[model samples]
Target: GSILNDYKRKTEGSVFWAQRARSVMPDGVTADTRVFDPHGLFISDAQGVHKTDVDGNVYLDFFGGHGALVLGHGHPRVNAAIAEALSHGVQYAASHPLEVRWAERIVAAFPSIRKLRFTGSGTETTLLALRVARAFTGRRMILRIATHYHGWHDFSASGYNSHFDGQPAPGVLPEIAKNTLLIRPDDIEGMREVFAQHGSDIAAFIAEPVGSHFGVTPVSDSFLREGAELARQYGALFILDEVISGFRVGNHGMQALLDVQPDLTCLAKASAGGLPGGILGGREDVMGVLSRGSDRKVLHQGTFTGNPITAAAAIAAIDTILEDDVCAKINDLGQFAREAMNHLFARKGLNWLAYGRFSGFHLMPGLPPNTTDTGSITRAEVARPDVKMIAAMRMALILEGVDIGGRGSVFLSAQHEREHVEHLVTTFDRVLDRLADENLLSW
Candidate 1:
């Protein structure tokens, strides 16, 4: 309890700021995920691998800008590109050279994406994919894996927060939810059963290639491949929402890892190196539905699509990612952290687990010691999430000068040093100790 009290004092400015904002905002923050126990850090400035909150307490940024900044905050190259863009202009509201080159680079990066269209953010990309799918197949139904987060939009948001029971989120319309089908992450049998009944009417089957919430519920490799085939066999467009996995999973993205061709792929998050941008790219034939000269076409429009500043930042980020092979480095960091932390847990006789794909390491506490094979795990498979444990761990982490993500996971960045991993693993061990000492943790 004293540990938490100390955290409150340390972040007193954040507490005051949140209190004032609660009067104007819903949860004292713009995004619900940012709000945490004691209070969310009101970040004053972020550069490289660290951020200082309003209280002047600086912490290593393992949240990695919510998995959107593999290049880390204010990367010089990205900032330089933005500066160059400003010299020319921001949005020209027309064709620009940067947009063309940006598209060219993205197209070259992913083999499945022969052509693409730009969107304002990841949400718009998913929404656009749905529309394109419906137009291409002349069908009304859409299919997606349960708990796969495409975006905050009504269509993708449907059935997202439910307990994998296929109920839509409250604000999403009942009729819209009815058209969007959701299946369990681990249930390939249930997935096929849905396709057997409604595949003919399904316009698209969408998923996050790394599993839900970027591998919180790890989907197996074979399972995803079979599911993609099910979509192909049933004449439904397969859409991979690589918003979290893209540019981070590897130099080429998750599609490269899976080696499965998708009809439509949604890209965002790190696409602009933490800037707001999204992309909907796909096979030439499937994306052809957007072609103007085609007999039938999908009409999508956004004023800020392919804005020059975003184009510059995204191009630089993509270039740096490929040249530096950032994924291999960050992925190694994640692997190193998990092994060290997992080893420490075993040494301490705790049942905590540290595992995930690419650079995301989700430290799941309170699991059985015998628990293994998380790859096939689904939302329903695990125990009801011990959120209090995570809250206690996170508050403790802030005290130790290290910050995990909103979901209580670590996302490594290319800017992160090897010592950063050592610090995080050691910091995590201390947080677990605090949780146990406060009776917030139990074997």
Candidate 2:
């Protein structure tokens, strides 16, 4: 409690800004994810793995530009590329060489993709992928796994567990919600049943290769393979949503890890070097629906799609990812953090654990007793902590100069090293101890 009070005092400037922002912006934040209980910090500067708030408090940033900055913030290569693009132009109404080069690099990295199209965001990519699927397959429905996040779009927004009564969101039309079949990730039988019932009408089966919600709930390789095969059997395309896992997990993304090729892959986050970009790439035949002269062509257009600036940044990011083997180092850091945090939780005798793949680490509390196997963990198995508890932990971490998602998800980057991981673990240990001392632990 004392540490949180100190943090409150230190972030007075942020609190003030948040108060002012509340007068104009809804919930005092632009993005819902950015909202925190007391107030989120107003970061004034960021470089590499560190971010400085308006109060001049520097913290090791684990948000990693919302999982887009695998190379970390303001890397020399990315900065140079952006600068070079600025010297030329930001947006061109016509095609450019940078876009061609960027696409070529993406195809080179992921052999599963023979053709690709750029979009403004991951949400747009997923939307476009579904459109292409419908156009190509002449089907009206899509199948998605429960709790796997594709984006915030209306179609993808339906069928999440967070929805009221496990139904679709209020704004989404019932007609559209009915079209999206939500199956449990591990329910192979449910998947089979859905395909059996509606396979002829299904356009595509889309899912995050890693179970969504930041891999807090992970999907097994066997499940993915089965899902892919079932999609083909049902005459539906397999759409892999790699918005968070792409490039961050590996050079070829989760497709390489699972050894399964998707008919379409939706990518963003790490795809554009901390910039706003997204991409949909896959087999030439499936993607050919977007080609000119196609009778069932899917129309796609975005003002900022394939802008030269983002393309340049992506080129630099991909080159650095391949040349420096950035993913290997980041993955190692994540493994180190997960192991250390799990050890800390076990030593503390708490119903909490840390688990994630590659550069993502999540600290999940309220695990059931004697649950030592991470694979057994599911979205329903791990109870969600109260907002007060999450905010308290976040404030404690802020006081200790560490930052992560409000829900305890941490995204490591190339800039993070052993020392950073140690600091994070130490800070988290202290925070948990403080919480326990304050009788904040439910157990």
Candidate 3:
């Protein structure tokens, strides 16, 4: 009732639009993750680091298009590229020079990428990556981290059972579920055992170099290295799902940061700048299986896989990221937010902490004060975030003129300057104080 009353008072326009949306769309939202309890905001406009709702309410946006807007919304270069491409064409329905150049730039950025295929979304990329691995290795099983989410597809949707009592998701077929092997993050022994038991049957071992669910929890570098080694030893392709981390963590992504080469890498999110696109690329030998005239040639075709406009936008996005060193600036902002938020938690004597790497920071409550290290944060701790408290916090932050992911994920962009970060910290302090006053927060 409190959420509904407060949200309605502040977002009358959004409430009306949401009601209208429900008539035509499921749950009044396109993406399930975007749905909030009472209702979600109907954004009218967005520009560098901020979004404006239909009710004239403006909030600093940390959602950053779910980690796709590394340079922030409506970047001038990206917009210009899109406009220029529009002058020429939107989709050619055939291969074009722009796609070739775009692929070349991607290959240059990632040394591990020798050949690649384009798709419409990250889900498609992962789906195709798995197909490539299966075709190449002649195996059926895919080893996946229990908490890592590749996409909503059947193959990946099933293994995300860590938080759901190890029960397979309801919609996935039991036959498809059987092909995916689940293992714990950072559990070297568990990984070894899985490989030992079904190594030969595993077509690929896939993981989010950063832990899945938007990197709220990240796997250790050591674990990543060991996983890659184990996959190679087991004769399975190592598939790195970089849908969220791709270019946001760094130009080359987590693979470059962790210095582990994956046999196949799935990318999307920031790959095409805020546009819809996906890519699967890796070792020539493994990717070579898609070559024509081969017995193992994988049938891959997409109507809008390499749309000219998306390619143009991606080129501009990549150029801006590299030329201006966007990742470094955003990473600095992320570190600042983490340290400031952690300090605020300590000052308030709250059982909460903020931690993450690169441009992502997570506000994790209910963790001990000394449990500051990212690796030390357990799966149970991440899974057990106080959902009601987090929802309240999100609503309160919105009232304070800031927006973040529902799970307290703060995504920084190159546009997030020091003043913006400071305002976020100060506003968070006020919001926490209000929650404490209301007895909504506990020590």
Candidate 4:
């Protein structure tokens, strides 16, 4: 609650920005998440590790373009690659050699992807993957975990079923919701029950290994292995929606770290550095269902599916990751950030929650009357009083030239350094002082 009071004072400017932005952009900003504060700071431009807003405020960027800036914004490699490709042409309706080269790089890095297809966004990857699943299994239903976001698609639209409330998304067909059997993540018993009931009719089970749909939660290796086993047993495909976790976790993606392979994997975000691109990779036989022209059965066509510019960006991004060992650097920075955050929480005696992969960190102060159940922390808590405290802390950090992450999750990049770490810690300490002064935080 103390946090809420502090937020009211610190985020006044950001709230004003959001209100002005809403008058133009849908929901004020391009994305729903950006609508967090009606007066939130709006970014205008960015370079490696920093952002400059329209208000002329500069900030150290940790959100990293929602995990799309693996090489950080305006990296020489990504810029050069995109510029060179544009000099040739932005796109071609016909095929391009770069597309083949990009596919080969992805396929080589991820051996499980015997076949691959490119798309313009992460949503398209899931959409096509679902279509492929339906084609392969000849089934209508897909088993989707509760709160695992697979982009803004019809099948992936439904959230975790709230049996207690029994209310699905407004305007969503009840039948459509029924087809997506929503089971809680890591609930082995529930998984067994669902599979026993509709395993035969299910086409695929999709999940994000590092959970973020509900909240930035992490999934255990055992859960992934079990999901894979069940999918195989039920004659259904397992899909890992790694649109967010792919390059964020490492160059190999989250699946590469899990040791459990999904039948189909969707990749986007950092997959192509900061370019607009996405991909779906899977077993050759299953992916064959996407073949068109000669097929006379299924069609998967898109003018920009393998557009040369996007493919070139992806190739360059992949090459940079390998050449500069970006993944390792990102992992190191992420660890440092997490450690620094937890240290702050400890010093302030703030009962907070934080967890993440090599990609980023999710930090949140425990809700009032904080419960011991770790799972309960993610349930909708109606912007806790401490939310103000968190907001205040974020504002203080921003004012000092560092951008706090969205939804309390910080996505670190290879561009960060010891200076950035020192600045963050110093800024956080000053913010904590403000919180204490306002009686918003107990130290």
Candidate 5:
């Protein structure tokens, strides 16, 4: 079937624009994740659960706005709010009611957050969260579980999205990276040993509550609960980077679903709707260090911090997520897809399946031949599939009219329905059939 040529042909517009982009931007992309093999996708428009590429290819959006568009694209409430915000003005560059209201809503949504500060994007939230932690505890070291991607900031970037090397990222000075202690994720004994050894010196321990990269391997509820206790016992704050899990999974994010809370929580993505926004929310005492009158006030300032448009959009998004019960509905759809996918695999006697929590559906292909579809896979199994095969499958799926993440993950929103889930399953079946026919997924 010549999958590569098929992709390149269907996305010629992407190739044309990408060639132009390469002349202006490095590697024809702005973000590292956008660098695809043939070329990057140039989206022209999006509505509901569908996105049209520059080539006029309308794809069922499985990448889901890089895990941000929980309400899908162009939600009426969010659009109206953005329009309303634009009418008033983009920014006053000073105090405003919208920002205050947004902050108040965030605090009310998460029980762990008493006070919060906004930033320009999720990456900035990591820096601000760590800074606030250090100021509150007067400590230098921060303990973070390995593979838990907090953001691209020096201390937190593990590049799990781009790659995971189990070490500090490049460009970060050894002096700065040394302060971050990385340990195996979901290892309770290891977590305790770390706390016993360096807890006093650790300002905070950050984790992705749903596991690294949103349940690629998965994190247990017990692990989060125990990890929080260990951090507190050692006078260190526990920070939950819900930048991926927040506003996407359930109302108030995974903290509520898991029944565990951290001292500090980073929020973004759906927090600002489709706009650029980041947040660091936590206990009033912990966040108070940033307050202007605090004894050790950590001055945090950015011109675009809590811009009026973001505030309005975020308010609308959060309100929609709550009122419409977007979480539960999308979660049911995700579960349906996973179950249907597993059944299809079992019927075909194929070594592939889907998993992930809440509204997350990840296709883990090329498992061991004898392994059954149990709706779960081991950490080792998570890495068993040859990356090239998985990537080929992604391109094949894209050619078949579905757009998923390169890593084979998808998030559902209110715009998605049972028919969309059915179509995703059908697309999976078709892609697998084609791959098998071509012997590309050879055992």
Candidate 6:
């Protein structure tokens, strides 16, 4: 992969943009999370598993916009749809046939949805879900998992680590954080205690059915069933935050795979073919609280709730995914990359691990050599060496003409061909070898 040479050239231009952005935007980027490379090789264009920066350097895209580009960057069909949508109107608050078609496709995929509402982003979907939950249940407390990110909204930021407060990306209000409760992700016993103590006061138990962050950690099927049971028994609603896991895991989202239907579901990420859109769908009775005509207690309104451009893009993307079996293609490439990485690690005697949903790959170094004894892994331990190895791997891969993604995992897309998989596997082996040679294997 000679994409590194291109990346080197690209970084030169990216550095200039980084400096220019610093003068105008705080932290030199529109969003703090947009910061990828420490050196700032900002992306300009992407398709398949490759990304090109302003400096004209191409890289194997692994992060895939943090799992946003399910169909891959600038998917031809989605791009064409957007172009056509532009020719028509981009923004129209009025309802259109595209919205109905989009909803029909989405609802068909996940039968858990009896009704659905569209929003501008994942944050909006989550915010509206909480509001709907409150209106339906008339409760104040909302239960959430520790370290599972819903979005950038104040309520969603509570469970994340607070130690990084001043590290150039501070967010969330302290008051909002207090209202949001954070518990260990897979801790069923802990959840039981919380529910027993304040189940009635809690409006909903919200979580990412497939852990979207902290290394794509997946909640067990048993946990999903049990969590739903617990919520139902306690009269609290179950809300699945499928923003990142939503079509990436399957056509109907993780809920479909787990066979546990949430009372409310928050979806985005790949739902609209990476276009900025989100959906909050769930049981008709629970969602009916949104209708002011039926009940005056609910108050929900937004200026750009279902913009025409995003609706058009989402509908087109859904149609393309179904027509082309993009989901299956993602699984194929994901398995290939994962198997290659695993085999390489075993051959090199490197203490690393890779696992994730279809179309996403996460590689972690310095993890416990054994997944069986992985129970004792502390958050601090998971963070320190993992972050170091991840940063080093990214740097080395960039030098090898490939761009690695995530602290450990990389998201894949449908456009990734066999060449991309082979390139990723080969470049990863080379970088892992370099890490071993430099005595960076054990920290």
User: What ranking of all candidate models by lDDT puts the best one first?
Assistant: 2, 3, 1, 5, 4, 6
Query: What residue pairs are clashing in model 5?
Result: none
Between candidates 3 and 4, which one is better according to lDDT?
A: 3
| lDDT tens per residue, model 1, 155-189 | 87766766345566778777888897888787888
**Highest lDDT: which candidate?**
2
Candidate 2, residues 1-443: lDDT per residue as tens digits? 47568777989999999999999999999888887877889999999899999989998999958889888889999999999998998776789999999999889888999999999999899999999999999999988888788788988887765762346687988888878788877878888888889989999999887677658777777888898998998889999898888888889888898888899998988887679999999998988889897989888999999999999999999999989988898888888888888877778788886877778777767763235566656536655687677778888888889999847899888888999888888898899987777677887
Q: Which tens-of-lDDT digit does each residue in 79-164 have in candidate 6? A: 88878877877557677777787888789988999999888888899888988887788888887776667887767665555522
RMSD of 2: 1.7
Q: What does candidate 6 score on TM? A: 0.90
Candidate 6 — what's its lDDT? Answer: 0.73
- For each candidate in the order shown, give its overall lDDT on alpha carbons: 0.84, 0.85, 0.84, 0.73, 0.82, 0.73
* TM-scores for all predictions: 0.96, 0.96, 0.96, 0.89, 0.95, 0.90
Instruction: Count clashes in each candidate, considering only residues at least 3 apart in sequence or on different chains.
Output: 0, 0, 0, 12, 0, 8
Which ranges in model 5 have alpha carbons more than 4 Å from their true place?
Answer: 158-168, 368-378, 381-383
Worst-scoring 10-residue span by lDDT in model 2: 368-377
What are the clashing pairs of model 2? none
For residue 68, give model 3's deviation from the true position in Å: 0.5
Output the lDDT of residue 148, model 1.
81
lDDT for 314 (candidate 1): 90
Better of 2 and 3 by lDDT: 2
